[PDB]
């Protein structure tokens, strides 16, 4: 981005699609402590799709890499905190596969 608008609309279109995928459900909002009470001690950079939407809209994502780092961390955080064949991790693999196909579709990583 010396074309910030192209980046913005590309990311917004990407994220709208990611949030539409059925495996995005566990990652739609920040982890509640009433469910995972040590989460925010164990996971020091928590990330979710609501926070990512707020970051997009406030122009946090000035590079594609900042967006991809946060998206990839939604998955890495899941795999660090949850059992590898838990439902949550099942979803994480499904959503990751889907967003890599999208990243590749949008020319955002190599195909």
UniProtKB/Swiss-Prot annotation:
Residues 3-106 form the Bromo domain. There is a cross-link at residues 33, 65 (Glycyl lysine isopeptide (Lys-Gly) (interchain with G-Cter in SUMO2)). The modification Phosphothreonine is found at residue 9. It is found in: Nucleus; Chromosome; Cytoplasm, Cytoskeleton, Microtubule organizing center, Centrosome. Expressed in all tissues tested. Changing residue 9 to A: Slightly reduced ability to acetylate and inhibit PPARGC1A. Strongly reduced ability to acetylate and inhibit PPARGC1A. Homooligomer; may form a tetramer of homodimers. Interacts with EP300, CREBBP and ADA2. Component of the TFTC-HAT complex, at least composed of TAF5L, TAF6L, TAF3, TADA3L, SUPT3H/SPT3, TAF2/TAFII150, TAF4/TAFII135, TAF5/TAFII100, KAT2A/GCN5L2, TAF10 and TRRAP. Component of the STAGA transcription coactivator-HAT complex, at least composed of SUPT3H, KAT2A, SUPT7L, TAF5L, TAF6L, TADA3L, TAD1L, TAF10, TAF12, TRRAP and TAF9. The STAGA core complex is associated with a subcomplex required for histone deubiquitination composed of ATXN7L3, ENY2 and USP22. Protein lysine acyltransferase that can act as a acetyltransferase, glutaryltransferase, succinyltransferase or malonyltransferase, depending on the context. Acts as a histone lysine succinyltransferase: catalyzes succinylation of histone H3 on 'Lys-79' (H3K79succ), with a maximum frequency around the transcription start sites of genes. Succinylation of histones gives a specific tag for epigenetic transcription activation. Association with the 2-oxoglutarate dehydrogenase complex, which provides succinyl-CoA, is required for histone succinylation. (Microbial infection) In case of HIV-1 infection, it is recruited by the viral protein Tat. Regulates Tat's transactivating activity and may help inducing chromatin remodeling of proviral genes. Loop3 is required for substrate specificity and adopts different structural conformations in succinyl-CoA-bound and acetyl-CoA-bound forms. Belongs to the acetyltransferase family. GCN5 subfamily. This is Histone acetyltransferase KAT2A. The gene is KAT2A. The chain holds residues 729 to 837 of 837 of the full protein.
